[PDB]
Symmetry: C2
Subunit: 164 residues, 2 copies
């Protein structure tokens, strides 16, 4: 019942899209480890949307069809706890991630108060969301191609390094 | 009259009332620069460029925002600065002055290209190509394939000088920030 001009007809098309996200993941980490927590988190919610859009556009003829499956004893569960995972999902369903994502890049004045990324995005939330972003990638696209397995070696190494 | 009219007719919700609130923005813009520098140097050109264009509209927004008339209630559509749909919210460029560090670093050619893209709105389109991926005429192009190294290095330089030539001087703080950006501008040109 839904369509897009962004509809993937080729395995190689998916691979290129997978690489694309692979680079963004690397990017959001590099920003995170240089203590750019706000800018990183902007990319993380970009990575989530881009993983949501790829996976959807494989089948197809906010849009967050990237809800990493949470199982107790799972890497994400014991990386951020169910404190954080609860809220990330919440914000995804309501779309408050868009509003969070806005505040990680763009200055803004609300109720005559000047909001900058630096004073809106914590290191904890920035770390959670990247892990979640990497988990969205992995549960939504890793395993569809041989390539995605090779790519996934690299995102597991970031995830580990982040988590521990 | 690039920007000049915006603050004489149009009103915004994004109005800067105090130098501390203008240094936040500056300290904000400083971050984005370093971020965009740091990407570019780890070869994330598309991504660097995405930020670079964002610096240009965040300098522009800050610069206008301190002068433009305040209208609290005004909507988000009907706000020139708040929404980054509006082309007319970049309109705060570097002073084009030949022999300038910019002209002597990238050349006079591309600078029109940028301002033409700036004035035409093609920057916004150039921006979307750095972050997302798109299918055009049943062809999938990805951010790496739309942006060149020499592109992502140009706009950073431009975006720095937009900041420098548009904000530096307004505060004591801005000078101290400017010394930082000056290394990165100069690092990039060599």
């Amino acid at each position: 019942t839904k369509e897009s001009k962004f509809s993937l007809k080729s395995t190689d098309d998916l691979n290129k899209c997978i690489d694309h996200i692979s680079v963004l993941i690397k990017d959001a980490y590099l920003l995170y480890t240089n203590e750019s927590f706000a800018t990183s988190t902007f990319i993380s919610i970009t990575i989530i949307e881009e993983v949501g859009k790829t996976h959807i556009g494989m089948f197809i003829s906010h849009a967050f069809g990237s809800l990493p499956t949470i199982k107790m004893g799972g890497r994400l569960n014991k990386a951020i706890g169910d404190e954080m995972i609860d809220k990330i999902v919440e914000d995804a369903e309501t779309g408050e991630l868009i509003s969070i994502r806005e505040s990680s890049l763009y200055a803004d004045i609300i109720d005559d108060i000047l909001e900058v990324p630096s004073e809106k995005i914590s290191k904890e939330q920035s770390r959670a969301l990247l892990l979640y972003a990497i988990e969205c990638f992995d549960d939504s696209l890793v395993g569809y191609t041989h390539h995605s397995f090779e790519v996934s070696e690299t995102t597991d190494e970031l995830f580990e390094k982040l988590a521990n």
